[PDB]
Design an enzyme around this catalytic site. Sequence first.
Site, PDB file in Angstrom:
ATOM      1  N   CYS A 133      32.758  -4.199 -17.090  1.00 46.72           N
ATOM      2  CA  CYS A 133      33.364  -3.846 -18.457  1.00 46.72           C
ATOM      3  C   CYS A 133      32.271  -3.273 -19.654  1.00 46.72           C
ATOM      4  O   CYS A 133      32.514  -2.377 -20.338  1.00 46.72           O
ATOM      5  CB  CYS A 133      33.884  -5.103 -19.287  1.00 46.72           C
ATOM      6  SG  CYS A 133      32.758  -6.444 -19.339  1.00 46.72           S
ATOM      7  N   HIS A 148      33.184 -10.307 -22.288  1.00 45.94           N
ATOM      8  CA  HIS A 148      33.962  -9.265 -21.853  1.00 45.94           C
ATOM      9  C   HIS A 148      33.815  -8.203 -23.252  1.00 45.94           C
ATOM     10  O   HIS A 148      33.644  -8.789 -24.513  1.00 45.94           O
ATOM     11  CB  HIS A 148      35.463  -9.334 -21.692  1.00 45.94           C
ATOM     12  CG  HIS A 148      36.168  -8.253 -21.206  1.00 45.94           C
ATOM     13  ND1 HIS A 148      36.006  -7.216 -20.266  1.00 45.94           N
ATOM     14  CD2 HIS A 148      37.646  -7.792 -21.729  1.00 45.94           C
ATOM     15  CE1 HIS A 148      36.988  -6.398 -20.223  1.00 45.94           C
ATOM     16  NE2 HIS A 148      37.896  -6.581 -20.782  1.00 45.94           N
ATOM     17  N   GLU A 179      39.425  -0.197 -21.547  1.00 53.05           N
ATOM     18  CA  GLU A 179      38.560  -1.194 -21.003  1.00 53.05           C
ATOM     19  C   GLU A 179      38.352  -1.285 -19.543  1.00 53.05           C
ATOM     20  O   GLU A 179      39.363  -0.565 -18.681  1.00 53.05           O
ATOM     21  CB  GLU A 179      38.835  -2.668 -21.541  1.00 53.05           C
ATOM     22  CG  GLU A 179      40.102  -3.190 -20.883  1.00 53.05           C
ATOM     23  CD  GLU A 179      40.492  -4.604 -21.115  1.00 53.05           C
ATOM     24  OE1 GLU A 179      39.832  -5.515 -20.488  1.00 53.05           O
ATOM     25  OE2 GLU A 179      41.517  -5.018 -22.040  1.00 53.05           O
TER      26      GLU A 179
END
Length: 474
Positions: A387, A436, A448
């Site tokens: 991420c 994240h 993402e």
Amino acid sequence: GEVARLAGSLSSTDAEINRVELEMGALREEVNKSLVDLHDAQAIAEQARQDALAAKKDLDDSQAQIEAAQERLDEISRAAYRQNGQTYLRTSAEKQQAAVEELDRLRTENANKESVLRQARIVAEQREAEAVEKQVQTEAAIAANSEQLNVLTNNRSTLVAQRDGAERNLAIARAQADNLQGQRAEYEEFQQAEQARIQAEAEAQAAAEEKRRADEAAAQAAAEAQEAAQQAQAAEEAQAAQAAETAQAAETQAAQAAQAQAEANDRAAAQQRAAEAQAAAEQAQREADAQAANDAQAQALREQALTAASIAAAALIAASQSSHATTQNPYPTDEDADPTDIADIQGDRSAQIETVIARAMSQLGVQYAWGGGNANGPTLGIVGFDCSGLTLYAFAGVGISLPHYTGYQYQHGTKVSPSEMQRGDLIFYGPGASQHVAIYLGDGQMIEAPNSGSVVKISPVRWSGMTESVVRLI
């Protein structure tokens, strides 16, 4: 640097990947079609059957209807015989004739219904057979297409094998280019592409201005040509009109002939001037489209150099930071040398945002690899992106160097309230961005690289677990 060879062969095997994916699609949908055909033939058959049934229903009703009227005639005769042991005799004779002729009616109606049943039954016979055929047809079509698909997917898996290997080599190339030529090397290359970007952008701006003005010129010359041709047209009129009038009429005779000469003179004069103005409009239009061709051509070079500049910006950043994937110290151990040494990473605008976003979307589909990714692209894990690795990759395209950790990325830029987020913002999740990261794409969707097993993908923005603020870098 032979990136571009592997980048090309990679992209061409991805072209082949999509050939085979659409081919597989064609077969898969083929079966879907004849599945549709089958279920509809089945519906046709069952409907023809319920028609046959409808036929027998009224035929049986006609049966017992006629028998009810026959039995009323029966009870009428029974009453007659019992009543044989005067106005009423007359009218009861007329009633009995009414019943007999009604029975004649119901009789021929029942014969017609018998033929209706014959045909409803034959129609159901036929379209039941039609459904049997089309049923076996598509079971066999499935067999054939399942086998052919299994072939296609064997080919597809070997193609993606090739593809993973080629990507892995491209990562090798990016590393050799930036990890190899130290800082000032990419710095020189970058300054070159930044200069070529500003120059070719200015050049394209100049070709665009001149194309616009040459287009104005084509318009003026074309309109002038059209004016002159219309005056030629009016000469045609007035000349044939003079011609008809002199056709319909001594010295008067010479006056007519002189006016005819003056008419013809004015005509050829306005006609030659019309031909001149129109050849001039033709030149102006050839210039306006030679110049529109160069404006397009130079705008292509403009964004070509703009792009090569952005990637060379990404390369400077890549060569500015350590591999954020290994541990082995890439520095000297004996106090007996002196390397390059990497930068330290730990704690208009609209055009700029779109360049960054194009980079993230360009990785849609890349597999996750823990810790994968740098300013040049995906990398091997502890090949893909995780991420915070993807965001690091995207913003290097506009020279924004980010650490390969969400908690630290949260410290860059400006902390905007989550309710005012806009395209380009970093959305964080987890306490202090510890879990994240994603890029807000605008219009309530974000891009993402989320968790193990999910490819780089676009997903709607999630509100559970969000940090208190978003970060805006441009």
